[PDB]
Design a protein around this ligand. Structure first.
Ligand SMILES: [Zn+2]
Lengths: 102, 112, 48, 116, 145, 49
RNA sequence: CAAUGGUAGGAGAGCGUUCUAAGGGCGUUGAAGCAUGAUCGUAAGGACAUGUGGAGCGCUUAGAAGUGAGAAUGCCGGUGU
RNA sequence: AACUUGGGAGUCAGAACAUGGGUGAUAAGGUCCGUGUUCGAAAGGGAAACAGCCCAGACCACCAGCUAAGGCCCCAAAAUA
RNA sequence: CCGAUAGUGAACCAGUACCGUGAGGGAAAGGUGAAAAGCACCCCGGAAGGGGAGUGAAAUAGAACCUGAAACCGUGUGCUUACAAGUAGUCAGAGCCCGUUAAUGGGUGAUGGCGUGCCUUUUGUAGAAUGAACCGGCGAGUUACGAUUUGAUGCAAGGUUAA
């Protein structure tokens, strides 16, 4: 019950039961996503994939594809009449780990 | 229950009334009558006939028992100011404030 | 000779920490159950 | 026809006051001084999102150095052994292993000092 | 803002070490003690919380200088009165109060924040081979290299 | 046409520039004129030739 | 696939404020204003719920301007130190 | 990306640094020309702090990787190699 | 076209208070309710003021009487604070107190990192160079005529009228 998957441009340490915030995936709500590149599988049978384990998988189910919290991006320089206000709100996909296939 | 009394636009600065209200806040009304008539400040005669009027409202209008009454809340609010002047040394005037006060006193038998 | 900055409300309420008054002595009278100042006469059927 | 000012200047000043909630004294209260702090607050937060990414990486390089010297190894000699052995797990994950499962961390140091 | 452990009070476990300054160099001993003292040898180092251990520098009378630092290496101070510098040499502060000598050297190698000087209070220095903290069960620590 | 869905010929009308109305409009403070000298003044400027 | 730091300046697209036209709506079973909130849009900004309030006010397309303020030893009010 | 014609301009107080020179005393954070940078109008990393020096040009987000100048006893990331 | 800082200086007993030897200068100040039905009577007090009772849809609609913002002044409280060097925030973050426009929530805040206001004027300002005590109002490229250039529309060797 200890895997290290590389989803997005990042890496997460998953555990069977846990929810995980990732980047925006190309799936609709309800279906299952399976990830192929896992780098490490802990527990009692450790498996250190060199770049990857080459035969392991993790399967999840997607929930609540949504946009992040709202963050204002403000900027100015002092004695010039010069400022810039933006708004941004980043998308995420919510997932739930189901089974860790080593 | 609670009983109330107010005196509006009493011509004494609210900074000065407030020194004497901090003496009777939370006291038993039998002890606060004496604090106000054993004190030498200018607002003391004014504050205690706001306190006696609230104790009278308690027994007559609300059928309370004065023995166990307490000063629950006592405060002075700023009333409206008068504009006055004082002539000065070389043709110029300066401003006098004649500041007033609203005074409120709540007594309570401390029950629910 | 004159203030360089205004005084904030915080700095004004700290200076006024000690600007207060205390209650008087004010014991009870033995002749009449009352209140009088210590070492003064009673202002209510004046006894001492 | 005449336009008078009313209801627009108070609506835009009132929004800045609510962004100043929790500031010390006069700067959660007055418009001119509160507007100046919400400007420096916006510009501080721009840097600090950039700088979060340096601060967190610097302070899990500190925990892999501590966990790698309990097997008599340096940080720079371990990170060079995991490079030429193939392992490509990032510093965020190596330090979460050294805290949770040291038997799997120490099982990986031995695999890194075989790659030299 | 994902999984990253952060230690806190009700999670910390501090220990006690004894360290012998018999035969060590002054400033080369002072720098391992400041790392023991600041929690940077433990995997759960958190910057805003006081990790780290207690250290008992046992001997402190046999610390060594090198070169000509016994009569060079003067320590200065100011009373905050006009013309108020005072000075003492490094070899004379070892003949007189050799514990203040080691305490001031290690404290200059810690930060000057509220936490940085809550951590130098975990330092106990003794001239001579005895300490009164026998009830704390101090272990022994060896200086690397 | 209907008298409630009128519409001008596309390209015939255009909104006028209003200078002196803040920094993001591009012509805020000095209002296009630059900084000093004869030409930045009210009515300022020699006349032609 | 490539571009996007910016003062003086040039160019483009917009947000909001009063009044008019036409169309269609909402209001004593509570309009506008005011206050509070953990809401929405890339921005200027837009809603919704409650409290107070007591008679008017939005929306769509077009038109017209006394159309947007933090600075001027600015002007007037009224409140500090 | 260059040229032509037409609409709108702002600018005419400049500054360090390196090099080729005049002036001054092979003085000046001096002054005046040639050439190149970059401040002006440029945020980020290094020179303790430090417009003009070294490195490098910020569309927004991320608790991902590897490099620059400068660094690796600890204040303070990284060899007490 | 204005809608009480506007529109006449003056919506009100305005060329009036007030200022000046005089010629002359020259303000501020609108709103109870449909209807006075404008609070009989009791209670504290010398009165003012108030607490009830009553009139009324409503009395914080009680004569400064429609609504009632901010600066400012108070009273009560949830979290915090007497070894600490602060352009007052921001990023990280325990402990405690709560429970929403229900969403990877709200309040506080031990301790850690990084951080010298804004405007103007300047080669260059944290500047010990300028301006602003705070809050509110309201305060600066207009439109008449003529010229020129661009868009858009009618007609075209013709186009168009002024009084
Ligand atoms: Zn007596």
């Amino acid at each position: 019950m200890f895997a290290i998957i590389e989803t997005g441009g990042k890496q997460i340490k998953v555990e069977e039961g846990q929810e995980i915030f990732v980047e925006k995936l190309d799936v609709n709500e309800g279906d299952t996503f399976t990830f192929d590149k896992v780098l490490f599988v802990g527990g009692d049978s450790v498996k250190v994939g060199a770049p990857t384990v080459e035969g392991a998988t993790v399967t999840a189910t997607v929930n609540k594809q949504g946009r992040g919290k709202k963050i204002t991006v403000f900027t100015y320089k002092r004695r010039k009449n010069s400022k810039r206000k933006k708004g941004h709100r980043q998308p995420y996909t919510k997932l739930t780990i189901d089974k860790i296939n080593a | 229950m609670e009983a109330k009394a107010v005196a509006r636009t009493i011509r004494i600065a609210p900074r000065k009334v407030r020194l004497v209200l901090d003496l009777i806040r939370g006291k038993n009304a039998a002890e606060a009558i004496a604090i106000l008539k054993l004190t030498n400040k200018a607002s003391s005669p004014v504050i205690e006939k706001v306190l006696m009027s609230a104790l009278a409202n308690a027994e007559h209008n609300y059928d309370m028992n004065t023995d166990e009454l307490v000063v629950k809340e006592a405060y002075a609010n700023e009333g409206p100011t008068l504009k006055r002047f004082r002539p000065r040394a070389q043709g110029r005037a300066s401003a006098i404030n004649k500041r007033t006060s609203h005074i409120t006193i709540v007594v309570s038998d401390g029950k629910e | 000779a004159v203030p360089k900055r205004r005084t904030s409300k915080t700095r004004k309420n700290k200076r006024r920490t000690h600007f207060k008054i205390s209650v008087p002595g004010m014991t009870e009278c033995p002749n009449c159950g009352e209140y009088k100042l210590s070492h003064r006469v009673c202002k209510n059927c004046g006894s001492y | 026809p005449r336009v008078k000012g009313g209801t627009v200047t108070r609506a835009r000043r009132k929004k800045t006051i609510k962004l100043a909630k929790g500031y010390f004294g006069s700067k959660h209260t007055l418009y001119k001084v509160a507007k100046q702090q919400v400007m420096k607050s916006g510009q501080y937060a721009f840097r600090d999102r950039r700088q979060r990414k340096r601060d967190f990486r610097k302070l899990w390089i500190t925990r892999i150095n501590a966990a790698a010297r309990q097997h008599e190894m340096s940080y720079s000699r371990l990170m060079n052994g995991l490079k030429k052995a193939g392992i490509d797990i990032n510093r965020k994950m190596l330090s979460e292993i050294a805290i949770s499962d040291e038997k799997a961390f120490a099982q990986l140091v031995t695999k890194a000092k075989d790659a030299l | 803002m994902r999984q990253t452990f952060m230690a806190n009070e009700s999670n910390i476990e501090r220990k006690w070490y004894v360290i012998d300054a018999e035969g060590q160099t002054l400033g080369r001993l002072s720098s391992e003690v400041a790392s023991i003292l600041r929690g940077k040898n433990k995997v759960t180092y958190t910057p805003h919380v006081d990790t780290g251990d207690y250290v008992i520098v046992i001997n402190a009378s046999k610390i060594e200088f090198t070169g000509n630092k016994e009569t060079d290496k003067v320590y200065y101070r100011h009373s905050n009165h006009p013309g108020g510098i005072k000075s003492i040499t490094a070899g004379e502060l070892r003949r007189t109060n050799p514990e203040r000598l080691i305490e001031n050297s290690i404290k200059g190698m810690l930060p000057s924040t509220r936490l940085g000087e809550k951590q130098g209070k975990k330092l106990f220095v003794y001239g001579g081979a005895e300490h009164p903290h026998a009830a704390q069960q101090p272990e022994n620590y060896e200086l690397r290299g | 046409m209907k008298l409630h869905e009128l519409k001008p010929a596309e390209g015939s009308r255009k909104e006028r520039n209003r200078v002196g109305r803040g920094v993001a409009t591009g012509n805020g403070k000095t209002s296009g004129r630059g900084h000093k000298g004869q030409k930045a003044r009210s009515g300022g400027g020699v006349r032609p030739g």
